[PDB]
Structures are given as C-alpha cells and as structure tokens.
Design a binder for this molecule. Sequence first.
Ligand SMILES: Cc1ncc(C[n+]2csc(CCO)c2C)c(N)n1
Length: 447
Amino acid sequence: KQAFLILCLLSAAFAPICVGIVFLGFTPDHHCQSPGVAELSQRCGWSPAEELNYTVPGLGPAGEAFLGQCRRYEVDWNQSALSCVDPLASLATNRSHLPLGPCQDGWVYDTPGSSIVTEFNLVCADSWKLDLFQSCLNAGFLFGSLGVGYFADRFGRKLCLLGTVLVNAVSGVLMAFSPNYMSMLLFRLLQGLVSKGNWMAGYTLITEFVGSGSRRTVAIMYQMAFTVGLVALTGLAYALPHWRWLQLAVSLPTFLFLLYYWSPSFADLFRTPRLRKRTFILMYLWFTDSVLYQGLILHMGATSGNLYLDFLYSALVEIPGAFIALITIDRVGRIYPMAMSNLLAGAACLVMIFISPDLHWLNIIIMCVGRMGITIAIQMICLVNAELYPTFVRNLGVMVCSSLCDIGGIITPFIVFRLREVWQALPLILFAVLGLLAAGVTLLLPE
Ligand SMILES: Cc1ncc(C[n+]2csc(CCO)c2C)c(N)n1
C-alpha cells in the first residue's frame, strides 16, 4: 500500500490544474487610474470612499458598472480652483455632461494580493481573454486524449508515463515564471496536453492492479483524493495571496513524486441503431455533466461574496455524495439514481435564479445541494458508460464519450463569463435546461 499514497497524490494534485482559475484569476473592483486624482486627495484629505464618491463616475439606473470601471472624466485635476467639498459641482450643471474617455494610464485594483487579471489587465475590452485560460486547458485535454494513446502505443508505457509526469511538472513550475500572456497560454496548453492523460493512466493502473473485489472502492477513493486536493487548494489559496506564489506551491508537490523514485473502429459505435442511441445518450450525458460541474464552479467563483468558505463548504459535500453513490450503486440501480441526481442539480440551478442576494445562508445550501447532485451523477455515469459497451469496443467508446467532456469544457467558459454580461441569470437558465434534459434523457437507457 506504499504506492497507494503516491497514486492518490497523482489525482489530488490534478485538482488545482482544472479548478485553480477561481483563485489564480479573480477579478477585484477597479476603476480608471488618473494621474492628478491622488495629489488632490492628499491636498484635501479624502478618505478612500470619499475619493470614489468624488472622482469615479456613478452607477446610475440598472447598475451600469461599465461607466465607472471602463471610463473616466477628462477634467484637469491639477487646477487649484477645485473645491475640496465637491470638485465636480463647480465644473458643470450635471456630471453627465462631462467628457469621458478610456483608461489610458491604467487601472487601480482594490485587493492586497494579485492575480492574472490584475497583472495582465484583463478587464473591460480584454475581459474575454480570461476565458481563454480555461479554453486552452480544455483544448489541450482534447488533443491529449488522442495524442497520449498513440504515444503509449508506439513507445514504452512506463517511460511514456515518466516523461509525461516530468513534462507536466516542468510546465507547471515554468508557468509561474511566465513573462506575458501568450507564453502563459502556451504553457497552459502544454500542461493540459498531458495532465488528463496522466490522470487517466493512473486511474487505469490503479483499477488494473486491484482485483474485482475492491475495484469500486478504489475507484471511489480516487475521487476522494480529488476532493482532498480541492480542500488543500483552498487552504493554500488562503495562505498564499499572490498567484505566482500559489502556482509554485501547486506544481512543486508533483516534482517530489518523481524525486521519490530518485481491432475496434470508430464506425463500430454507430453501426447498430441501439448502439447508436446509447452512444448519443452517453455523449450528451458526459457533455451535460462536464458543463454543469465546470459552470457551477466558475459561477460560484465569480459571484460568491465569501469565496474561501463557500469553496470549502462546496468541496466537503462531495464526500457524502461519494458515500451515497457507493451505497446506492449496489442496492438500487444505475438509471433512477442518475436521473434523480441530474434532476436535483437542474432544480438547484433553477431555484438559485429567484433567491435574493441577501439570503446567502440559503444560496450556499442550494449550491451545496447542486454540487452533491452533480457529484453523484458523475459517479454513476463513470460506471454506466463503462459497463454499457462490450469489451471489444469498450475502451474506444469510453474515449469517444470522454471527448465530449473536453468539448464541453472548451465551450463552458464563454457561457459563464460572456453570456452573464448580457444577463446575469442566463447561465443559470441554460444550466437548468441542460440538467432537466439530462434527467429526462437518462430514463431511456436500459437498466
Ligand atoms: C473538470 C472536471 N474534473 C473532474 C471531473 C470528474 N471528477 C473527478 S473527481 C470529482 C469529484 C468527486 O466525484 C469529479 C466530479 C469532471 N467531470 N470534470
């Protein structure tokens, strides 16, 4: 059981890679930096809130945070004629008539730490570039899911695994030293090429080593290790407030993992109408579950008012989800539990639309229920997908079904970030529709 610790570490360290954007890429409050505002504030003695009151454009009806975050007044603050009580009052009849311009001189972020958003200025016009951080990782996942099988077929298995683990560790450490956004994106793609391949290889090894009398228990323990990795990520993110500090502390543990040492065809899946239907349903279920999981995590990261405690509470509820899945697998079945778990997540996403922002105590409960639901659904599907295919084409079908997860991971970040700008509740509407459809579709599969 000595190698069990390192094989579980291989899965625990995979958590910060796919979920670390919540802490490495947070967006703090910001406004246009102005050169003459600071001197006037020191002259008059403005408090931090009074400076925002007197300088940044107001919100107005319907929120409209765009005018305050991406625009500024072009008034010459260097003029001594400005009164300390209200400098904008004597300039015009109303503040709406003042000229506006972009933040030419930069931005001011109200945070003690840092992130990729604050360092690369991924705000306003460039705000879509933050979505590329996860899309590049998921494109790397998709390409690796094809490349790694070819590499392992034409090269030594153990040497290939060692090489991929070393590549992942080196790319993770190097990304903490990235000088610009393009190199960071390239390192992210390189890391995503090998991360999921290594995770799947470790899972396959740990399932092959253990006999049939304990395969399910170890498979569940593999996800328990991911949950423990999420908890450790939350702790490290609380301890290290800078994104470069957090990135090194995430990648370095995988280095000690190496330091511890020192024919089926694609056309087959759709040749039969029943097999075609099962393949389509499994593809849709994998896509829906991946979209729901990633979107819920990103939405929590983007809208929660207490990120650390919400993330900790959401991560913990996965463990009861794993226990419930384990109890329900051998007593009830696979179709009804999966349908119920998907319906629970869909209903939780639907309810969160109407909850008022001040009812945080209920919002966190609904979020935890939804996370437990998607966790149970994923645990069920990880067995349903595998056991619904014959042994001859089981692995190829599993790979094809899992590629839909990577495609959904590619698409998801633009749904959560960009579509929320059009309307805040729209991503939740999409998630509710997808969850309800997944609940409905699941019933068609045979028991
Ligand atoms: C991005 C992403 N990461 C992991 C999983 C699957 N998964 C592995 S461990 C775990 C939590 C315990 O069940 C889950 C959901 C997924 N579907 N999407």
